[PDB]
């Protein structure tokens, strides 16, 4: 198939993003999303384009990787698979899906040069990336954190025993911006800091993200060191405070495949925080979605809550989950989280909650998530297409989170909050 059209209809219900502390923050809306694509392959070469047309009753989210209507170019790349005789080896250039199984490093569409090498024994990847635009009719300027930020990254891992992998992973980001000079008026679209960061990681998995595992016990474990420096802006520009960064992040999980249908598991993750001038404040690459198959179903789930959508930054999370599935027809995940701040005086990086944290309070909150999918036989897509992980065929899916703020959110804030979606996907 050289041509296709992915059709997505979505309802999003959100209430209340700011927990009743500001105007807005709510949605209860519907949208249709059309994505015509073209694929072609000749010799060692291939090329790919995917566009996007969206019309919605309000500004809802139609993917998990501003006007009510817009057009976009999501993907456009050329690929060359002639460098070696390995079938799992190719080099890809242009705007593409950068993804890794945990989703905690990269899960995004971005302009890139990315080299992939996959074999039974050994997987490796290396690449560079940078955003130059959103390629959307409704956005004119990059987010400040993306402006002039380059990414270089790589990974290498081996399968040391059947279904068990271990490997290393690295990523580096350089903010080569010229922070607003002293005096000038700081724009909302201006950077809040610049610097250079390196993440060095080790990871071990045993069918961690394999929903068809032949093993009764699956696991994941990763440890990541973050080091570099930052120059932070101090609305008129007073100057900058430069400082080193040395921080740490970890993520652990166990999953028991009770039988072919039923699974249960637990998880823990921490990203350091605090220190002088935020020296020990861990943070992620900025390319991550934090979504994966950690509950052991075909459906991906936000590692840190559909609702809270925590970033691993001054953040501690404990997780409990069950999941069910029936062949390739259905799946469902039930997930419970509790969240804490590591340093009760610093912020917690990005989330799906826009409300101030009270100093001295560690109890961020807790959340219950439900994910339910029915898959249809029609629209079977080849595993080589990037959307395969989320939308391998036509399907209908419910994805929801209910968040209960803890003491870290003072009085005046709502006692409950939710974000929930229904997604319907059809493919022509």
Tell me which residues touch ligand C8E (CB under 6 A). Answer: 42-43, 45, 78, 266, 268, 316, 318, 340
Residue 194 CB: number of other CB atoms within 10 A?
21
18 binds, among ligand C8E, Ca ion, none (CB under 5 to 8 A by kind): Ca ion
Q: Which is nearer to ligand C8E, 268 or 330 (CB)?
A: 268
**Beta carbon of residue 126, minimum distance to ligand C8E (angstroms, whole number):** 21
CA distance 85 to 291: 33
Q: In this structure, which long-range contacts are made by residues 235-239, counting pairs with CB atoms below 8 Å and at least 24 apart in sequence?
A: 235/185, 235/186, 236/183, 236/184, 236/185, 236/186, 237/179, 237/180, 237/181, 237/182, 237/183, 237/184, 237/185, 237/186, 238/182, 239/182
250 binds, among ligand C8E, Ca ion, none (CB under 5 to 8 A by kind): none
Q: Which is nearer to ligand C8E, 287 or 342 (CB)?
A: 342
CA distance 334 to 149: 37
Q: Which is nearer to ligand C8E, 17 or 302 (CB)?
A: 302
**Beta carbon of residue 21, minimum distance to Ca ion (angstroms, whole number):** 7
**Beta carbon of residue 19, minimum distance to Ca ion (angstroms, whole number):** 8
103 binds, among Ca ion, ligand C8E, none (CB under 5 to 8 A by kind): none
Q: Which is nearer to Ca ion, 20 or 154 (CB)?
A: 20
**Beta carbon of residue 343, minimum distance to ligand C8E (angstroms, whole number):** 12
**Beta carbon of residue 42, minimum distance to ligand C8E (angstroms, whole number):** 6
Of how many residues is the chain composed? 428
Q: Which is nearer to ligand C8E, 135 or 339 (CB)?
A: 339
Residue 375: closest CA among 316, 328, 318: 328
CA distance 343 to 257: 35
Interface ranges with Ca ion (CB under 5 A)? 16, 18, 25
**Beta carbon of residue 385, minimum distance to ligand C8E (angstroms, whole number):** 20
CA distance 142 to 75: 17
25 binds, among Ca ion, ligand C8E, none (CB under 5 to 8 A by kind): Ca ion
CB 321 within 8 A of CB 372: no
289 binds, among ligand C8E, Ca ion, none (CB under 5 to 8 A by kind): none
Q: Which residue's CB comes closest to Ca ion?
A: 25
Q: State how beta strands 330-341 and 315-326 pair.
A: antiparallel
Residue 61 CB: number of other CB atoms within 10 A?
15
């Amino acid at each position: 198939k050289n041509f296709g059209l992915d059709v997505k209809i979505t309802g999003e219900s959100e209430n209340d993003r700011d927990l009743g502390t500001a105007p807005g923050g709510t949605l209860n809306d519907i949208g249709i999303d059309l994505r015509p694509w073209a694929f072609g392959q000749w010799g060692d070469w291939s090329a790919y384009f995917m566009g996007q047309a969206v019309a919605a009753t309000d500004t809802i989210e139609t993917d998990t990787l501003p006007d009510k209507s817009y057009l976009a170019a999501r993907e456009f790349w050329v690929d060359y698979a002639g460098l070696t005789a390995y079938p799992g080896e190719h080099l890809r250039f242009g705007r593409q899906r950068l993804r890794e199984d945990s989703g905690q490093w990269q899960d995004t569409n971005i302009e890139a040069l990315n080299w992939s090498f996959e074999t039974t024994l050994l997987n490796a990847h290396a690449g560079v990336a940078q955003r130059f635009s959103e390629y959307r009719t409704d956005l004119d300027e990059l987010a400040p954190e993306d402006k002039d930020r380059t990414h270089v990254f790589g990974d290498i891992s081996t399968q040391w025993a059947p279904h068990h992998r271990i490997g290393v992973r690295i990523h580096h980001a350089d903010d080569s911006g010229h922070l607003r000079r002293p005096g000038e008026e700081v724009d909302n679209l201006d950077k809040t800091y610049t610097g250079q960061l390196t993440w060095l990681g080790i990871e071990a998995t045993g069918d961690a993200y394999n929903y068809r595992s032949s093993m009764p016990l699956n696991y994941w474990a990763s440890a990541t060191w973050l080091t570099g420096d930052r120059d932070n802006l101090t609305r008129i520009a007073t100057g900058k405070q430069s400082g080193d960064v040395n921080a740490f992040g970890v993520d652990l999980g166990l999953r028991w495949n009770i039988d072919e249908q039923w699974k249960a598991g637990v998880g823990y993750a921490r990203g350091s925080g605090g220190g002088k001038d935020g020296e020990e404040q861990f943070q992620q690459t900025g390319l991550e979605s934090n979504r994966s198959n950690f509950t052991g179903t075909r459906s991906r789930v936000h590692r840190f809550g559909e609702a809270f959508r925590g970033e691993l930054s001054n953040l501690q999370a404990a997780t409990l989950f069950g999941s069910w599935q029936l062949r390739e027809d259905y799946d469902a995940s039930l997930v419970y989280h509790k969240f804490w701040r590591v340093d009760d005086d610093s912020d917690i990086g990005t989330s799906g909650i826009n409300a101030a944290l009270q100093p001295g309070e560690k109890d961020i909150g807790q959340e219950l998530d439900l994910v339910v999918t029915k898959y249809f036989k029609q629209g079977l897509l080849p595993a080589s297409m990037s959307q395969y992980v989320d939308e391998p065929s036509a399907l209908i899916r419910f994805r929801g989170g209910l968040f209960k703020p803890g003491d870290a959110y003072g009085p005046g804030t709502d006692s409950t909050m939710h974000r929930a979606f229904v997604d319907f996907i059809w493919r022509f």
